Amino acid sequence: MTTHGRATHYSLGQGNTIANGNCSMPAVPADRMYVAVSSPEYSGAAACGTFLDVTGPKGTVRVQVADQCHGCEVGHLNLSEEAFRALGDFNAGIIPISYVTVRDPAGPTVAIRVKEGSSRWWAGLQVLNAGNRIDRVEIQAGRQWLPLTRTDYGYWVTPSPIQDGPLTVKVTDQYGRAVVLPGLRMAPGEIQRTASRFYPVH
Ligand SMILES: OC[C@H]1O[C@@H](O[C@H]2[C@H](O)[C@@H](O)[C@H](O[C@H]3[C@H](O)[C@@H](O)[C@H](O[C@H]4[C@H](O)[C@@H](O)[C@H](O[C@H]5[C@H](O)[C@@H](O)[C@H](O[C@H]6[C@H](O)[C@@H](O)[C@H](O)O[C@@H]6CO)O[C@@H]5CO)O[C@@H]4CO)O[C@@H]3CO)O[C@@H]2CO)[C@H](O)[C@@H](O)[C@@H]1O
């Protein structure tokens, strides 16, 4: 649904290659089109990875939800400086906006990043390029599926130890669509590409 609100500007800088913004992006977007949302809209990092089409005075740009703006109220987006300048005048400081969460945006294949410090005793998984909100991330334990806990920093963590060897991970989005990612390695910090998609390329 269309949310009507306002926008201020801030920056995540050049960032690092580990964690950028509250969603813990592996990198600050090269196009510098990102946004921090209010705490209720952040929804415990459930909005991480999703994209917003934000309509401003000078048009409409697409930005990736990347961070949590604790000081922002509902409807108040904290845009990147580049996204702000493209929508309105930078000297204005505040601009009137309206935005929607993009449903199934065109993007690359799903990628999984195992967090630093992850072992068989404890592991954190980050799902990338899913396109939409993710409701469920599970690791295969024998013939059953061990559900992971959604953290408020963009990762999914194990509530209990997992088996050794390659990981078989099932990810389910907000639309009930699920993909299974076999052969995932316990490699902390690495972005593991896949050939899986929640929706086809057209
Ligand atoms: O990006 C901007 C935002 O940043 C947020 O801050 C984040 C931060 O970026 C992020 O890095 C951080 O992530 C940390 C997790 O929160 C934390 O839980 C995690 O701790 C792990 C640890 O990495 C892991 O090594 C450890 O494994 C233990 C295991 O627990 C223990 O059971 C096991 O013991 C077994 C023995 O090894 C075994 O011999 C014996 O037989 O059995 C034992 C068990 O019975 O030992 C292993 C180690 O070998 O587990 C812990 C968790 O329990 O570390 C992460 C970092 O690496 O999270 C931050 C958020 O909380 C800001 O908060 C936000 O404001 C910014 O916007």
* Tokens coding 117: 């410090």
Neighbours of 44 (CB within 10 A): 12
Determine if residue 186 is left, alpha or beta; phi over 0 gives left, psi from -120 to 50 gives alpha, anything else beta. Answer: beta
8 A C-beta contact, residue 26 and residue 113? yes
Return the best residue to mutate from 121, 152, 156, 160 for the ligand 1 pocket (most ligand atoms within 8 A of CB).
121
The DSSP line for 150-161 is: EPTTS-EE-SS-
Can you tell me the distance from the alpha carbon of 43 to that of 41, in angstroms, rounded to the nearest whole number?
5
User: Which experiment gave this structure?
Assistant: X-ray
3-state SS assignment for residue 197: coil
Give CATH for domain 1-104.
2.40.40.10
What does the alpha-carbon distance between residue 116 and residue 87 come to, in Å, rounded to a whole number?
A: 37
Q: Take atom 67 of ligand 1 and give the residue whose Cα is closest.
A: 22
Q: Which spans in 71-170 are helix H?
A: 81-87
- Indicate where the chain has its CATH 2.60.40.760 domain(s): 105-194
Ligand 1 centre distance from Cα of residue 156 (Å) = 12
3-state helix, strand, coil in the chain (%, to 5): 5, 45, 50
Q: Where in the chain is the domain with CATH 2.40.40.10?
A: 1-104
Q: How far is the CA of 117 from the centre of ligand 1 (A)?
A: 6
Say whether 26 sits in a helix, a strand or coil: coil
Tallying the residues shown for the chain, one arrives at 202
Within 8 A by CB and 6+ apart from 166, the residues are 182, 183, 184, 185
178 C-alpha to ligand 1 centroid (Å): 27
Name the residue at shortest CA distance from atom 53 of ligand 1: 122
Q: Atom 2 (ligand 1): residue with closest C-alpha?
A: 22
Distance set, CA 29 to CA 5, 23, 128 (Å): 24, 13, 13
Resolution (angstroms) equals: 2.1
CA–CA dist 20, 147 (Å, integer): 25
Give the N- to C-terminal CA distance of the chain in Å, as an integer: 24
Kindly list the protein residues whose Cβ atom lies closer than 6 A to any atom of ligand 1.
Answer: 19, 21-22, 24, 116-117, 119, 121-122, 153
Pairing of strands 156-157, 124-128: antiparallel
Which CATH class name applies to 105-194? mainly beta
